[PDB]
UniProtKB/TrEMBL annotation, chains B, H:
Protein name: Major head protein
Organism encoding this protein: Staphylococcus phage P68
UniProtKB/TrEMBL annotation, chain C:
Protein's name in the database: Minor structural protein
Organism expressing this protein natively: Staphylococcus phage P68
Organismal lineage: Viruses, Duplodnaviria, Heunggongvirae, Uroviricota, Caudoviricetes
Stretch of the intact protein here: 24 to 50 of 647
From TrEMBL, chains D, I:
Domain of life: Viruses
Protein name: Lower collar protein
TrEMBL record, chain E:
Originating organism: Staphylococcus phage P68
Protein name (record): Uncharacterized protein
Length: 301, 39, 27, 99, 55, 301, 34, 39, 99
């Protein structure tokens, strides 16, 4: 065995563990989610596991979807000098075209044999795994300050008397047993002798700190396009209440969509409809209020 | 498998790629060849 | 539950630990 | 929060010096008032005076010899069942400086 | 020969080809298209198109 | 090995790193987005990769779209003296017209052979890569001040006593373990002896600083035309709430559109409709509320 | 209910056919499983 | 979590696998048990 | 925050000068009160006085010779298990000026 604990400022190591674990957790959660936002009229007719596509797109490798046996299996694809042949690395096994491939972008609208590359972002300047590191430390220390604020927001009622058995019988039989009408000696024995340590310099501070945590989440959120935007259009709470500057959050949402524009180039080739929409739906009540067809009653209940 | 799958390091927020390939070259000693220089 | 010190007894062992704290006496 | 007291100190150090309160000579002396330690500390005889002046006031005496007994009495019977603050006896040397 | 389930996740499914892609190429052609000095007995010096290599 | 760390005013280098990285990030992000705003009735029938067009337009090089084999491939194009011939630099390879080219602007309305040049901005005075440098440093130091403000907004409850083991047993067994009714000596031992360092000179300062960051984003935004404008027309929040002066933000949005007016000159030639609209759309809920045709149910779900 | 309890201990369940009626089974670059 | 995801390591070109499993083998003393030896 | 103490200083400097507390002559002397260092600092003999007057008060004496022992005693037994502030011994020369 080996044991000799520090003190009870162990909490001052537990506090910094909460901050450190919050940064690690929020960082890898936020990129645990971020490669699924778009999902684009999900599997109309096309054999793509779009989850495996979007995970590949957020490590910035240019995937290439084409035909394999007329059914659109993904492949990897790493002034205008045109690409034609299957020179690139190919991830499937035997489903390779073994024939004339092409990029279907500008050779014509809708004619050439399909192997179209899809960028994550049309013009690439900085990776957004750096922006997610940029705010999560700032977010980490505001989560530190919230946790440190509510950890010292606890309150005792200090009794103050010369020690051995004068005031103990008082609080036992007449405060925590709830008793009104306790009788005492005239020796100033509650003339502000019992005192309260309060932290009312802490609870007005508490709510404003939560609002700073909240709008910093929103200021990370609208950067990476994930937004509450369309419902904010129909709710009429459009500007300076949701302090987000709508023209910037509809801006950063759009760059990821027109990065995945070459799926429309593919969609024009084989005669089908694939639009890169932007997912904001969460179900069992939204699907109920949009239909209210009695077959949807036998589906849910 | 000439480009292997990438490696992201989220501790530095970084993306690392490798390229592997197996090359081999030799001269077979069973064909005619000559050499003209000032040795 | 209800943490009680049900023995309350008398001792016969002696102490002057020539030391700054409990800690330095353990050392 | 609880640590060492001061009654327990001089009780244990006086019982280190061969004394007892129950079976002292051979007869049962628990009830006899001149033997149990609380009376020796309230009377504050030569014996408790010696053990306080060696373990608590390890290098001190006051000016006179009639006031000094009065000060050591008025210290050690105010604080019998009190407490200790700095966590170790022979390490509350804060007592010697506040003397 | 033995089957088990020969596809496990990685390096049990990598003893086969494993996505042959972007093979090393002579798309730009040395010794024929370049390393070339069979340039015809022309008339004048007409132009040499300068392109900013964005890609 | 080599190591001897400075102090823990390392933070005063971490603070200036956050400012410096914020300026670099916001600057190159803002021009990472800015060459896609218009996109102009996206690929009705016309073989232009418009993303590659708009990226070319924001480096101010006058592109020229014409015909190649009747299908409108882009080419580069660098008092009225008319241009006719293919004297300009040509980026495609063999698709060149090798025939009578012309500019289709004023020779007639809709008659001449097509090679029309599209300006980024009709009259050019200053590049907007300078205005984006003009606000991003001002924005950088207000992001500095927000980060510096929330980094020192953290709060401790200072205990004050003569040191060695008087008040430690107090806070351990009676504050962080939550205990009410802690008993103490009469020696003034909480008569404002424990004190709180608060920063309530910092949290009223916090919200106003975020509003300054927010409206400075909006004052960069309406300069470069990217605006929340049309939704602000239908929301009735038109003036002095969105503090933007609507007549200036509908002004700067319009200059970029009528810079790309020669695509209408081209559109009149070959008999098709191309209007330079101004993108403000973000989908899966806007596309749902604008249609509510049951085939759009089988698309999304 | 037995599926969702299995999913939150992260074990990849596999639903297929048993006699054409979809009984649950447990299931622990792309290399295909057959 | 019977099979953890592989670690690729392209710089040595060396894939790596792990296998976890948890187990709790105990018995309950609430049932009839008889031991027979020559001890 | 933690640095050097002052009990550890004169303990280590007195043990540099050949002393010990456990195996001093040959017999086990851990329990014997005239040998371990805490009693030598509370009694504050000639020896600890010499090491304080050389390492802490490196160029000082007070006016008299009976008050000066009283001042050096009342300094070094108030501050045994205290702390140090300016991070290095023979570099808290702030002590000599506040003297």
């Amino acid at each position: 065995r080996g044991l000799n604990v520090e003190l009870s400022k162990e909490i001052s190591k537990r506090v910094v563990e909460h901050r450190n674990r919050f940064k690690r957790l929020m960082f890898n959660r936020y990129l645990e989610f971020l490669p699924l936002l778009i999902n684009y009229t999900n599997r109309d007719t096309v054999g793509i596991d779009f989850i495996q596509l979007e995970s590949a797109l957020r490590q910035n490798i240019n995937v290439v979807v084409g035909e394999a046996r007329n059914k659109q299996i993904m492949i990897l694809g790493y002034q205008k000098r045109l690409t034609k042949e299957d020179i690139y690395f190919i991830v499937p096994d035997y489903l390779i075209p073994d024939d004339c491939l092409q990029i279907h972008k500008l050779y014509d609208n809708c004619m050439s044999g399909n192997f179209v590359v899809m960028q994550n972002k049309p013009i690439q300047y900085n990776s957004d795994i750096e922006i997610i590191e940029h705010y999560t430390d700032e977010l980490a220390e505001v989560a530190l300050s919230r946790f440190s604020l509510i950890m010292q927001a606890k309150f005792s009622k200090i009794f103050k008397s010369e020690i051995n058995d004068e005031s103990i019988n008082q609080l036992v039989s007449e405060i925590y047993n709830g008793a009104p009408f306790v009788k005492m000696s005239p020796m100033f024995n509650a003339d502000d002798d019992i005192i309260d340590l309060t932290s009312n310099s802490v609870i007005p501070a508490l709510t404003e700190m939560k609002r700073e945590y909240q709008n910093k989440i929103s200021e990370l959120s609208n950067y990476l396009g994930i937004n509450s935007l369309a419902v904010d259009k129909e709710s009429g709470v459009s500007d300076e209440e949701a302090k987000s500057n709508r023209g910037f959050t509809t801006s950063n949402s759009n760059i990821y969509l027109k990065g995945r524009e070459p799926i429309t180039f593919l969609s024009k080739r084989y005669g089908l409809d694939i639009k890169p929409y932007y997912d904001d739906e969460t179900t069992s009540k939204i699907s109920m209020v949009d239909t209210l067809k009695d077959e949807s009653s036998d589906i849910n209940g | 498998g000439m480009l292997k799958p990438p490696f992201h390091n989220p501790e530095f927020d970084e993306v690392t790629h490798w390229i592997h390939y197996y090359s081999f070259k030799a001269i077979s000693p069973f064909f005619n060849k000559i050499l003209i220089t000032d040795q | 539950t209800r943490e009680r010190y049900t023995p309350f007894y008398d001792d016969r062992a002696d102490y002057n630990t020539n030391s700054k704290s409990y800690y330095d006496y353990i050392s | 929060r609880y640590t060492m007291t001061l009654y327990d100190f001089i009780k244990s150090e006086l019982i280190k010096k061969g004394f007892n309160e129950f079976v002292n000579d051979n007869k049962l002396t628990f009830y006899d008032d001149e033997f149990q330690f609380m009376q020796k500390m309230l009377k504050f005889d030569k014996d408790v005076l010696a053990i306080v002046n060696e373990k608590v006031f390890k290098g001190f005496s006051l000016k006179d010899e009639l006031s000094d007994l009065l000060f050591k009495k008025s210290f050690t019977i105010h604080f019998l069942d009190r407490e200790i603050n700095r966590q170790t006896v022979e390490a509350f040397g804060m007592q010697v400086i506040t003397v | 020969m033995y089957e088990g389930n020969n596809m496990r996740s990685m390096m049990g499914t990598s003893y086969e080809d494993s996505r042959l892609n972007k093979r090393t190429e002579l798309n730009e052609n040395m010794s024929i298209d370049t390393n070339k000095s069979e340039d015809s007995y022309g008339v004048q010096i007409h132009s040499l198109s300068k392109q900013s290599f964005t890609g």
